[PDB]
Design a protein around this nucleic acid. Structure first.
Length: 141
RNA sequence: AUUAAGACAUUCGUGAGUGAUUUAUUUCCAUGAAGUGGCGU
């Protein structure tokens, strides 16, 4: 996680997932001037193959037709996404509002075998959604 | 504020109903209430 300016994150006991699933945080501050994306890609370096793109985190593309046109083979799978949408001042005591649209992402471990060249085209299509990239989606090696 | 929060695998339920420790088996087999006279020559 990257926190801007004055923001302290203390280790505590947290809730993550349904049925009040309980977890323990350990907050460790790594050295400064570091890029977390570069750290994740360094971790994923050992799975790199130059003839294909490896999907490491759930990847979303608005239209799969262009992606399929850009590669010869899509040895891929699909996962489901639906977010609980809450405003900054919401009820928080009641049935939460969920995303009215159910979204399909590319499963991690999927591989895209692009044509000759055009790797930059697929990469540009994937990184066109920078909001998802910041959150942790659409990460590849 | 995170496909989230709330939710006892719980309620009712006799290990109970029928059942003879009974049937078959001679306290029986063998066995002498018997033995001997004595003295007075």
């Amino acid at each position: 996680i990257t926190l801007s300016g004055e923001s302290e994150l203390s280790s505590d006991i947290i809730q993550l997932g349904g049925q009040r699933s309980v977890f323990r945080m350990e907050v460790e501050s790594i050295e400064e001037n570091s890029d977390i994306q570069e750290k994740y890609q360094t971790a994923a370096q050992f799975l790199t193959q130059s003839d294909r793109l490896l999907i490491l985190s759930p990847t979303y593309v608005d239209n799969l037709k262009e992606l399929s046109a850009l590669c010869n083979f899509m040895w891929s799978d699909s996962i489901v996404f639906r977010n609980i949408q809450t405003t900054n001042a919401s009820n928080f005591y009641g049935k939460p509002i969920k995303s009215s649209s159910k979204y399909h992402f590319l499963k991690p471990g999927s591989v895209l075998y692009f044509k000759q060249g055009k790797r930059k085209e697929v990469e540009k299509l994937l990184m066109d959604y920078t909001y998802l990239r910041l959150s942790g989606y659409n990460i590849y090696i």
